[PDB]
């Protein structure tokens, strides 16, 4: 949870791409430069999209990160995110993340993006009832039962999945922006009671 003594970036962050991300974030000259826990505590935001990162090992020592942009990497294991208790905005599109149990304790998370991860089973997301924004487009999802617990969602994208049953969305009265194009939907009866929708996209269903 903390680095005890000043330590070279490249020792804390074994993924060479992620070490370079941290070096640039802290405006250091080299990944051989040492950092203190106090310097790591100064990091509020990491922008590391499209960076060829395979592991974010070391990120556990960044307790104050609130915004994390990791779209377009080579992640499979997000366990090092487990205890990032202040994370509010998390972008993980275009990785291959399937085990969502590491997200359970991100109790301050407001926005989660997991587009284009090949995901089918989203039952782990039941553990994030405080979410306000959730982006799951371009996956292999059929069963959205668990999203009925996410009663604070105001923006939800499920576009380009394999959903036919949207009954679990019926109770989500705070939804404002709902993106359901490119699914298998023919029956929207359960959405009839949503009163706060501003955007509801349903283009290009494939009935079945």
């Amino acid at each position, epitope marked *: 949870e903390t680095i005890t003594v000043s330590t070279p970036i490249k020792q804390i962050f074994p993924d060479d791409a992620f070490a370079e991300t941290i070096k640039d974030n802290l405006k250091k000259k080299s990944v051989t430069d040492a950092v203190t826990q106090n310097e790591l505590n100064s990091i509020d935001q990491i*922008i590391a*999209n499209n960076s060829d990162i395979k592991s974010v090992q070391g990120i556990q020592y960044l307790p104050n990160v609130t*915004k994390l*942009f990791l*779209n377009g990497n080579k992640l499979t294991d997000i366990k090092p995110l487990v205890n990032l208790k202040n994370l509010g*905005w998390l*972008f993980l599109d275009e990785n291959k993340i399937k085990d969502l149990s590491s997200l359970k304790d991100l109790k301050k998370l407001k*926005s989660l*993006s997991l587009e284009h991860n090949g995901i089918s089973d989203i039952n782990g997301l039941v553990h994030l009832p405080q979410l*306000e*924004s959730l*982006y799951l487009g371009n996956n292999k999802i059929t069963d959205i039962t668990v999203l009925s617990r996410l009663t604070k969602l*105001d*923006t939800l*994208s499920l576009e380009d999945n394999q959903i036919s049953d949207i009954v679990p969305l019926a109770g989500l009265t705070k939804l*404002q*922006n709902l993106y359901l194009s490119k699914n298998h939907i023919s029956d929207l009866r359960a959405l009839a009671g949503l009163k706060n929708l*501003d*955007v509801l*996209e349903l*283009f290009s269903q494939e009935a079945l």
Partner: nanobody
Amino acid sequence: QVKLEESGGGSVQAGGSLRLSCAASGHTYSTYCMGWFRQVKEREGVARINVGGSSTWYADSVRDRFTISQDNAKNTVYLQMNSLKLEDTAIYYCTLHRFCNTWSLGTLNVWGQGTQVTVSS
């Protein structure tokens, strides 16, 4: 791929008004968030609208002086800046994202080139 065509700005006397416009092309979105950030310090959101929807957002410092509106068919938004104040002097940038809650972050947006607005007196 997405072009943001911006117009408007310049110099205006305090208490006066200016209108900015921004037109998006090359996107595929039925609905999307478009509006302005400004920068003097760190950039900050000013106002946005969901083009193809209706929802708007304003920064507290401009509410009730600035009005944002859309022409959905022309993929254009307009910022009517009334009651201009010295504190409004900044570079204003049109900016776009499919999703308004992400638009607010800036980081993932399409960014225009920006226009200088200077308020005098």
